[PDB]
């Protein structure tokens, strides 16, 4: 996350870190045994870490839980990035508590202008690299489809929307992929891609979670 602030410890209890040895993507807890992330965060083996704040320090309250199933969207397209969403099933259920809890799936796409909250452990520079120890957060509006297409002519599919600031300076970034965009109590987006991070006219592009609501339901039902 570039241009944001360190979250208050454990105030985003839905945020998870995916780890294969080190942290490499974000995700969102949506039920006790299921996490949403990005398809391109796929790896064969993944550990989900919940209740994290500082990913480098054992604080005693994290839950470390291996993924038992890792299911990319069956229509995820490697060429265009269409349908960049993935579900992970935990090998045993998360214990819900003040520090670890679920974020609700959305009931409508989000409107342009809506202020959202984006988070994770990605890079904090637009130029160079500085990867933070503690979870970062950023407040950012949803942009119109028009501004989003104009920013990335020809590349914005139906599964995608933009969130950020056209003047640049604030955006998600590498190692944030998979993490949540929450608007008014609901999970509206997944961190996907952009040209650079926080460059002017290059807002972050995010997968529209609302479009996958039935797929998520079905996939949970089919793997219980």
């Amino acid at each position: 996350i570039v241009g944001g602030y360190t979250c208050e410890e454990n105030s985003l209890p839905y945020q998870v870190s995916l780890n294969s040895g080190s942290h490499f993507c974000g995700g969102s807890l949506i039920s006790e045994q299921w996490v949403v992330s990005a398809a391109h965060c796929y790896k064969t083996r993944i550990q989900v870490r919940l209740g994290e704040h500082n990913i480098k320090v054992l604080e005693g309250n994290e839950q470390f839980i291996n993924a038992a199933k890792i299911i990319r969207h069956p229509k995820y397209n490697r060429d265009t990035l269409d349908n960049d969403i993935m579900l992970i099933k935990l090998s045993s259920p998360a214990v819900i508590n003040a520090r670890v809890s679920t974020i609700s799936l959305p009931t409508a796409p989000p409107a342009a202008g809506t202020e959202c909250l984006i988070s994770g452990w990605g890079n904090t520079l637009s130029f160079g690299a500085d990867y933070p120890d503690e979870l970062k957060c950023l407040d950012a509006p949803v942009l119109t489809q028009a501004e989003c297409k104009a920013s990335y002519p020809g590349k914005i599919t139906n599964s995608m929307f933009c969130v950020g600031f056209l003047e640049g300076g604030k955006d998600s970034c590498q190692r944030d992929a998979g993490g949540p965009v929450v608007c008014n109590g609901q999970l509206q987006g997944v961190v996907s891609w952009g040209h650079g991070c926080a460059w002017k006219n290059r807002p972050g592009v995010y997968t529209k979670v609302y479009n996958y609501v039935d797929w998520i339901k079905d996939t949970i039902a089919a793997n219980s």
Binding site: S22, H23, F24, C25, A38, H40, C41, Y42, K43, R78, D79, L81, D84, G122, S172, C173, Q174, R175, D176, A177, G178, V191, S192, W193, G194, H195, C197
Partner: protein
């Protein structure tokens, strides 16, 4: 075989660490792949990269 490929991170925002040929330095190195739209200059191991490149 690998002398004419750059190392491409791509636009995605994961950190999938991989191997690629660095043409200037002449060897296989670790690089941070963003997870999408790479080129053919990326491999899961040093071994796989050295074999494909020579």
């Amino acid at each position: 075989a690998c002398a004419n490929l750059p190392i491409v991170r791509g636009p995605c925002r994961a950190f999938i660490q991989l191997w690629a040929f660095d043409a200037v330095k002449g060897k296989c190195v670790l690089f941070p792949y963003g997870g999408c739209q790479g080129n053919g200059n990326k491999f899961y191991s040093e071994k796989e990269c050295r074999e494909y490149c020579g």
